[PDB]
Ligand binder design. Sequence first.
Ligand SMILES: O=c1nc2n(c3cccc(Cl)c13)-c1ccc(C3CCNCC3)cc1C21CCCCC1
Ligand SMILES: [Zn+2]
Length: 118
Amino acid sequence: KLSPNPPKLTKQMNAIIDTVINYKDSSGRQLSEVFIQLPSRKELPEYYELIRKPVDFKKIKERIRNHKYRSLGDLEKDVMLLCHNAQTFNLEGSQIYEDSIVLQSVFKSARQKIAKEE
Ligand SMILES: O=c1nc2n(c3cccc(Cl)c13)-c1ccc(C3CCNCC3)cc1C21CCCCC1
Ligand SMILES: [Zn+2]
């Protein structure tokens, strides 16, 4: 039986992503900043050539709003993809690559705290 996303579920998804977006490291840097929006096609076409399924946090929020994720697992898949793409395009040890590893962890913590699924 297909059915709409319960408002409870949508609110959880938004709280989890807000936690990830709002996260600041110990120096006060908001790690999500560069990841909110993809590079433009014009300025970085090689990104769109190398990366099969580009995604940014703007698109993830839109997919929540449009009820494209049907589960926390769907949401996780897109956040993991975002981070995977970062680690695909960017060099090991770069700030962006390292940040993406932290954000994966922040996501997994936020999901545990906010959904309490265990
Ligand atoms: O993997 C990413 N990787 C990058 N960006 C991403 C944005 C959202 C999601 C992901 Cl997963 C990435 C991103 C965005 C904008 C610029 C800039 C914004 C300022 N003018 C030039 C393009 C750059 C980038 C890089 C690629 C180039 C090196 C830095 C990170
Ligand atoms: Zn891959």
